[PDB]
Design a protein around this ligand. Structure first.
Ligand SMILES: Cc1cc2nc3c(=O)[nH]c(=O)nc-3n(C[C@H](O)[C@H](O)[C@H](O)COP(=O)(O)OP(=O)(O)OC[C@H]3O[C@@H](n4cnc5c(N)ncnc54)[C@H](O)[C@@H]3O)c2cc1C
Ligand SMILES: Cc1cc2nc3c(=O)[nH]c(=O)nc-3n(C[C@H](O)[C@H](O)[C@H](O)COP(=O)(O)OP(=O)(O)OC[C@H]3O[C@@H](n4cnc5c(N)ncnc54)[C@H](O)[C@@H]3O)c2cc1C
Lengths: 522, 522
């Protein structure tokens, strides 16, 4: 039941294996108990959850000289991201981008005929399962031996009160409490929602014990939905998305959002806007069999032994806002002030638990900023004006105001974009750069070369927003955003040193546009 | 002979078609003559060469209100990049990256067996030729109709003197002259260097009238050499690189350069350092047959009907520095002061013509900066501290000092990198992000997940240099460099918002490392 790992010093590999074993043990495995039982000082903070925010938070506070304790249901630190979130998601996104390639040039060059070819989903999510523990074991080993971090894994945390928490059957006290439990996968209140064939991002990497059929239904219209959507599509499975409202609302710039959509459509993806699932039919055995759903244009039935749920993630606050009596928002997000402080004192919330944006960076900063505050610091954090992205078969990166948006905000904008305005529209070997070259030179695929734009303020010449579809631009937005935040003028942008061919052709195009007396041109 | 295109207004497509025709016509085609014969003002500057530097410079000067003229040998604006340089090089790089993937997972997943499979080089360079004319046509159409730029294409420029140039059989006078003729492919003074089978970057996209054999010989050790080298290797052909000195010197941080090499080695590439070509044997017919060369370890003969020369590019200064009597450097570079001014007054040099760095950004900036100066501005330009990159089967981005390099400069460095120090070395699913997920989770491919490092100065903790091997990092370095030049501290870097999984895991690692009292750790 309880394993005092304190003095064992397992190898990363040993960790990886031990993790697998616990993770697969039928009874839930033993409890990893790792606490320095010689230290006299009391816990400056106990992290409820050792994932993105939890882990980071703990490492940062520990580095400040404080004493911390992490508690997690899972036998490893890290959170959703490396077990069923980001990571496995990127894996599928990679395939998505590759398959769309293999399929655009089926037979041609070194590409096999994809016609009639449907890739094995299970097989790939199986690969993921086969290695995802490697990093875990590294996280565990590296946290205990190098960071001296104290934690208790594979054990649910019992927050008794404001200064006490229980785990491993013992009782703990701490000057503070920082909640980092995150959010759980969204769900649908409809009959059949539990039919064997239904899946969500998390349940997919643990329950896919069969290979899906020629058709798949994805419910949702934002990130994860589109991401996993375009991946199933890529596997050569008719994919029908049922969106409650509108897909990819996150892509504020219209043209960009449009280009993306048309690309998905073009891959055979069927996106239904304003569609609510009526119910999910089963078999005599109990597995999914077909999906019935209402759409603005009447009901419709669709046969499929596979359904993936891509609804928003739900902050796991309920039970905690009950024990501590915390304030919650309209989405169940634990309210926190500019210091990650909840209504209750000495208590902090940091993960997805505080709602959007529900990204790693927020999780890591928030969990870090909080630990800093408990150590007496008065740092305030309010995520606003940040870079973003999402996959499909392409990489969609965006930051700032979309075109339309800027006008509504009063600005008199001008816009530089690629490809350019020509009677040939998107059917040009523009824009091009790494991983879009083939699309650019292929026969009738140029319109796939990718799409990008930048919003600039005429008079004040400041960059208001950057939008790019393609590849190799994401990592750039992290840094491009910072500069934009300092006050980047089209002039200052056109003065940088580009690396042609660059995923984003903003630098050169700015230099050129900036030269004109009046920015207007488009 | 001379076509007054002035009043014709062709379509982008007509331009493309016209360009292909002129480009394939046996007598060299007609001269495109596009000069505004109504304007009274004299030319503020005539650009000798209308490629990267020329075209751009012209656009900027035109935008400033000045009158300009472009002249050229080629029937299109743009230069080497879109015809036989960058672009085609990228197309080969993508294939190089895609093939390495495909080959690492032969038979696996949707990946066909690659064993014994050799991709068609001719076919892929044939695809490039089939569409490279699209962008020219656009460059041409856009330049004349939208930018009102004046030019003369498909006609070598005759610089009579300091203020006069001849073209299309007419004589022109200009207040200034700005030479942007660039550099021509390097060569080897050895017997057989001309045997039909010998190629270079520019001759490959115009004379590859056959399909290479099972073996290839590349002469060189830097960018284009390795670039085309990993591609031929990728097509599954024994590739032997003969390096006069040492390969990839351009990658200053040792570890980085080391990783990159091992990878290539791993791909079957044979790289010979301190190797010079003795001679190139031919056939009764006259095509390459084998290569003989000296290596530290005695001479060696290697049979091949295909040889690619990847030597440095040689500034096209000879004949111009003879007419204007310009000062030159040890490499043939037209000397210019901080104002792109040559020894001769009213004469500016800007392309690869001025030597290194020979990249698009320099050619464009210098091209642009010079034009600004002729308009009266006193802008000085001296390329230093710029981002850089080059392909293999991986994308290699570096900027600033390498580790070893920082020390030699007196700095007492610390270094945060991926993967981390562990008994599993590189064989871990770290680092990972887009397009490296499969390598990361494959069986025994983790060591291919990639490599990346950052050099930080203990005390002042300012960033000295970033190094990354993988994909989707190049474009980031453009902006990451800008911030590093502002004086970026490991603290300010850890504070940015990352987009996990990010090609570069710098942000989050620095936030964590910056927390510690003393950066030391490695
Ligand atoms: C499919 C998908 C893809 C994504 N891709 C990206 C991406 O590419 N980039 C990005 O920046 N973000 C991405 N995100 C979002 C990102 O995963 C989250 O914002 C981030 O993981 C949240 O971190 P956190 O620490 O708040 O929560 P988590 O990392 O989810 O961790 C919460 C932790 O608390 C523990 N816990 C929960 N309840 C209890 C309990 N009762 N007792 C004990 N422990 C408990 C968990 O076991 C876990 O360790 C993605 C999300 C999904 C669903
Ligand atoms: C294989 C290869 C790959 C490369 N990849 C990259 C890359 O990825 N990124 C990057 O930034 N740089 C890259 N470069 C380098 C880059 O191509 C050059 O630095 C840049 O093109 C130089 O521009 P320029 O204007 O100086 O010369 P060019 O663009 O080469 O143009 C010179 C112009 O002058 C004309 N001209 C020459 N002689 C005459 C004459 N006698 N009469 C009339 N016109 C004449 C030409 O026809 C041409 O239009 C690469 C180079 C090579 C060889």
């Amino acid at each position: 039941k309880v394993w005092n790992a304190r003095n064992d010093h397992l190898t990363i590999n040993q960790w990886a294996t031990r993790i697998d074993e616990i993770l697969e043990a039928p009874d839930g495995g033993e409890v990893i108990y790792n606490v320095d039982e010689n230290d006299p000082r009391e816990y400056d903070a106990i992290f409820i959850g050792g994932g993105a925010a939890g882990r980071f938070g703990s490492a940062y506070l520990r580095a400040m000289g404080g004493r911390q304790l992490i508690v997690d249901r899972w036998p490893f630190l890290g959170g959703s991201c490396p077990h069923n979130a980001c990571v496995p998601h990127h894996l599928f996104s990679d395939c998505a981008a590759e398959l769309m390639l293999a399929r655009t040039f089926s037979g041609q060059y070194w590409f096999p005929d994809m016609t009639e070819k449907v890739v094995g989903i299970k097989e790939v999510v199986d690969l993921f399962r086969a290695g995802r523990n490697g990093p875990h074991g590294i996280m565990n080993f590296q946290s205990k031996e190098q960071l001296n971090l104290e934690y208790i894994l594979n054990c649910p945390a019992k927050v008794i009160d404001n200064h006490t928490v229980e785990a491993a059957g013992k009782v703990f006290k701490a000057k503070n409490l920082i909640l980092a439990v995150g959010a759980g996968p969204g769900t649908l209140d409809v009959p059949g929602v539990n039919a064997k064939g239904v899946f969500d991002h998390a349940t997919l990497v643990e329950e896919l014990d069969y290979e899906p059929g020629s058709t798949v239904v994805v419910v949702g219209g934002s990130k994860t939905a589109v991401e996993y959507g375009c991946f199933f599509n890529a596997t050569g499975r008719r994919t029908v998305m049922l969106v409650r409202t509108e897909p990819l609302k996150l892509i504020k710039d219209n043209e960009t959002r449009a280009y993306v959509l048309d690309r998905m459509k073009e891959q055979g993806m069927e996106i239904i806007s304003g569609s609510n699932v009526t119910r999910i039919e089963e078999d005599a055995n109990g597995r999914v069999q077909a999906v019935v759903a209402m759409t603005p244009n009447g009901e419709m039935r669709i046969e499929t032994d596979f359904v993936f749920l891509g609804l928003g993630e739900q902050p796991r606050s309920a039970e905690l806002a009950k024990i501590l009596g915390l304030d919650l928002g309209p989405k169940g997000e634990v309210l926190v002030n500019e210091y990650l402080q909840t209504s209750v004192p000495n208590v902090y919330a940091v993960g997805d638990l505080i709602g959007g944006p529900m990204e790693m960076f927020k999780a890591r900063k928030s969990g870090c900023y909080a630990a800093r505050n408990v150590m007496g610091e008065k740092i305030s954090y309010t995520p606003k004006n940040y870079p973003d992205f999402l996959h499909t078969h392409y990489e969609v990166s965006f930051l700032g105001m979309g075109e339309e948006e800027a006008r509504a905000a009063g600005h008199e904008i001008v816009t530089i974009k690629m490809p350019p305005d020509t009677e040939n529209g998107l059917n040009v070997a523009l824009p091009a750069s790494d991983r879009t070259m083939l699309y650019a030179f292929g026969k009738g695929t140029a319109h796939m070369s990718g799409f990008q734009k930048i919003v600039i303020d005429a008079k004040t010449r400041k960059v208001l927003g950057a939008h790019h579809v393609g590849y190799g631009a994401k990592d750039a937005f992290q840094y491009l955003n910072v500069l934009i935040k300092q006050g980047l003028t089209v002039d200052e942008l056109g003065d940088m040193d580009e690396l042609f061919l660059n995923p984003t052709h903003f630098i050169q195009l700015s230099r050129l546009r900036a030269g004109s007396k009046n920015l207007v041109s488009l």
